[PDB]
């Protein structure tokens, strides 16, 4: 998809110390825009991006009302699922639910998705046609039958194809400065001698947005798949991302090595070399 709106729900039981905790986070692409924490003092859906702050009190009262109802649902589901799996009231368990919609380059509906997990395992998922379900086991099959009889997929599909993409289009326009931006990576290479025989060459990509990026190392233009240390893309904390890739090279052979950076903000893939 070109753009996406996604919500992530987590409910965790803590039998020893009170009621379950529920966390909800909303994203547009790689940018978080809303949060709700059942443990927090506000008891309100809270803004986490400046462009969503423009929304009026009716929006915030509506999101607060809905998120409090989802909080209740997912905290209670823990007890329901514990019973479905014959589990004791002693242990801590997890409920996770993710869903959202993607739009194409034209900002028109492309896909919808919805998945539910219990204790980090798939439980039930909406299929890509937004009309049928996939149940993981015996217990999930009974949820599936219940949702089939109640025509849940019809309501979910109407939300994913309608409401979800209409509000995504609204956010993309209102938050265009933040959301429609491309921050090409700021790239550099560092050299760190390991010994008198070898040196580490580290190819950096900083301050980029969106998170999607490809860093590859080559020796004489041959991909160094096996010998590259590639770190997971990580958040900088300011709404941008970071990534690096490193290779250990024989001292004096640095010139044979090249790093290539591919990113949306780069008109062409970029070649980096060690410049002594």
């Amino acid at each position: 998809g070109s753009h996406s709106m996604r919500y992530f729900f987590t409910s965790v039981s803590r039998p020893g110390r009170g009621e379950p905790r529920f966390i909800a986070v909303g994203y547009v692409d790689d940018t978080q825009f809303v949060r709700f924490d059942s443990d927090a003092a506000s008891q309100r859906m809270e803004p986490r991006a400046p462009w969503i702050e423009q929304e009026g009190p009716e929006y915030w009262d509506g999101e607060t009302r809905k998120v409090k109802a989802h909080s209740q649902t997912h905290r209670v589901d823990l007890g329901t699922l514990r019973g479905y799996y014959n589990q004791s009231e002693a242990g801590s368990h997890t409920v996770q639910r993710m869903y959202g919609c993607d739009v194409g380059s034209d900002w028109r509906f492309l896909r919808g998705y919805h998945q539910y997990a219990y204790d980090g395992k798939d439980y039930i998922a909406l299929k890509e046609d937004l009309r049928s379900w996939t149940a993981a086991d015996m217990a999930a099959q009974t949820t599936k039958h219940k949702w089939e009889a109640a025509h849940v997929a019809e309501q979910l599909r109407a939300y994913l194809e309608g409401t979800c993409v209409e509000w995504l289009r609204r956010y993309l326009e209102n938050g265009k400065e933040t959301l429609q931006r491309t921050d090409a990576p700021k790239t550099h290479m560092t050299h760190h001698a390991v010994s008198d025989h070898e040196a580490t060459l580290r190819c950096w990509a900083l301050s980029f947005y969106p998170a999607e990026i490809t860093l590859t190392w080559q020796r004489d233009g041959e991909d160094q798949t096996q010998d590259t240390e590639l770190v997971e893309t990580r958040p900088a904390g300011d709404g941008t991302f970071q990534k690096w890739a490193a290779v250990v090279v024989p001292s004096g052979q640095e010139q044979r090595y090249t790093c290539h950076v591919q990113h949306e903000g780069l008109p062409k893939p970029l070649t980096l070399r060690w410049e002594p």
Partner: peptide, 17 residues
């Protein structure tokens, strides 16, 4: 913009609204 609980599907037993 969030879906309502009935749009997502209620896994468990009915609870007072």
């Amino acid at each position: 913009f969030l879906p309502t609980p009935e749009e997502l599907g209620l896994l468990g037993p009915p609870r007072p609204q």
